[model samples]
Target: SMNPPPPETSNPNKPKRQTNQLQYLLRVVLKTLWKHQFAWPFQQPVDAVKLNLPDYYKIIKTPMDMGTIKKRLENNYYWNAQECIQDFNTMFTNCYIYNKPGDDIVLMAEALEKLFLQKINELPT
Candidate 1:
């Protein structure tokens, strides 16, 4: 009870300490973002873009498993049929149809596009 240790005097540098804390918090936030989202190669074409139609069919052919496509749709927040069709059309017109190495490739692309749309139509509303 001897004056309560001089009332535990507050440091004048508390503002600096708060500033440092803020800087540390900001660094942690930025580091987390970099680690999770921005750290990888952001460009699609540059990273691992390839046609690999067989691989695609392997994914989409049987039982209409929606794992990969569903992830994409979920990431896009359940895009509408029109949006999906537009994306497919763009990919076919710009990439698959013209760049295909053979006529069979073109037919395959068309069929796959139709199949994709059909699957989309069948999805629960």
Candidate 2:
């Protein structure tokens, strides 16, 4: 199922904001995977898996402003689980197309899921 749309505004000329639905979904999937019985700790997960290069470039074109992503990750705590999942899925799909086929990619995906789950579980219930 699709996420609900963002609220409508009267300003028609304003550019539409990119929704964070993909990120939130990824977070939820990761959380669930971590909580499952079959999960294991990732010894050396790649940080690259957490990034969406194209999307990053789309939002920030200059070198100095590129750090904006790093800052956001560092300071921003609130995130939608669903949106995270979608972004994660996209990253893995891209990796699979370009990289050699092996268990490493799978492990990375699993690790990401586990990490997200651990963080989400720590939230106040």
Candidate 3:
């Protein structure tokens, strides 16, 4: 059901404003992920000394965390939502590589990833 007169004007006649629905939705999705139970380990970067896995750095060359992801999002570091989402993917991928497939943390990572994908799919546009 389309409106007779569309609310949004697609033409480039008027000056646009800041922050559209997609960007807003991106932030919302991120916040939700932060609140998830499986997000605990991913909230901050892995400390080699604290975690006592010196080889973690050697194995996972590129480290990603929710803190950095949100920071980038807030700073407009991503060109698109896909770019931001890729960081989430990388975070999970790093976990998968660093931990055993049967580990509890790995299972949590799997659940969080599934949840992330479902939320992303719910975006209207």
Candidate 4:
């Protein structure tokens, strides 16, 4: 049994307004990884989890600190995360093929969170 993607249209004709379930899912995953455990390795997992990530986020443009983000804005810096992902999206398309626009997406981030938590739990606690 398969379920249609939650109300999506991708014809590029009369139908356009685009986005991906996969991308949304990953963004949520990274967000949760940071908000909960303090790590997500996507850019700076440990930094998001519980360390420093300014260097990683500067390159990735996936900001963690609002203050750092402001300083960037105070400068002439106008680049945003969208710019970073566009290049990668094209590159990913060119590099590999996968099934379903987002079949690769895990239904939730909790699975990984559980694993990470267990590993973290195993440490000197």
Candidate 5:
């Protein structure tokens, strides 16, 4: 599980977060993160709209509907990084390999992370 991260980040501390190309990518990555968590990305309610505000955040849109994204991530038992990359390349056009952080890939990886965690939980003592 390795995320090379859009080649590099100018800030280092965080991906360049502003009104530009990579900004949206980070937003989606973060959202997918929460979805797979116990919060919205993976929320307790599983689905509850939060009343928060960031003008820029309000604007970023997730192209893949949650259902479709989650379905693909969970349904697959096996996947390689490259295969996942090729599959969603077109869908998350903004995150093209050496370009922005492909939202699709980020989500896929995070979902897989959660799956792995769950699998580990099932193992006998």
Candidate 6:
């Protein structure tokens, strides 16, 4: 009954079970975030000219928004969940940088970011 005691070691190199789940989770999270009361300003790209903020483009190198994120998600632009989350972070960071520390926009971004983190943490294991 001795077969050289087949060494026991968990396979850490195994691929993830559900790659698509993260995308689905992200979509759900985005939908929830988009419906927030403070989501108006972040729904679409900031219109530098229409909004009369000419320096927005200069201050924000890579602009990100909820609408654009949805488009990218549908287009499969993100390679992984991290990429998708990074875009959200960029969006929030841009808001923080462009708005005053205690401004409504910055507060909104912070709230949305907190909600995002909570939602992601609630995703199925």
Please report the candidate that would top lDDT against the real structure.
6
Which digits, one per residue and each the tens of the lDDT, describe model 5 over residues 30-93? 2444445433332221121343323312333322233333333343411332333332332333
Question: Model 3, 1-125: lDDT tens per residue?
Answer: 21122112223553333355337635677888899977888887777767677687778777888877776666555545666677889999999998898899999989989988888887775
Clashing pairs in 3: none
Clashing pairs in 6: none
- Candidate 6 error regions (>4 Å): 1-18
Alpha carbon lDDT of residue 23, candidate 4?
36
Question: What's each prediction's TM-score?
Answer: 0.33, 0.29, 0.79, 0.20, 0.22, 0.80
Off by over 4 Å in 1: 1-74, 77-81, 95-102
Model 4 agreement with the true structure over 69-114: per-residue lDDT tens digits = 2232233233343532343233233212321343432222334436
Per lDDT, what order, best first? 6, 3, 2, 1, 5, 4
Task: Tell me the RMSD of model 5 versus the true structure.
Answer: 17.1
lDDT of each: 0.34, 0.38, 0.72, 0.31, 0.33, 0.74
Clashes of 5: 11
- Model 2: runs farther than 4 Å from truth? 1-81, 100-106
TM-score of 1: 0.33
lDDT of 1 by residue, 1-125 (tens): 11112111134433212233233222442233224422232112211124433333333222111222223333342224443344335444533523455666455545555554554444442
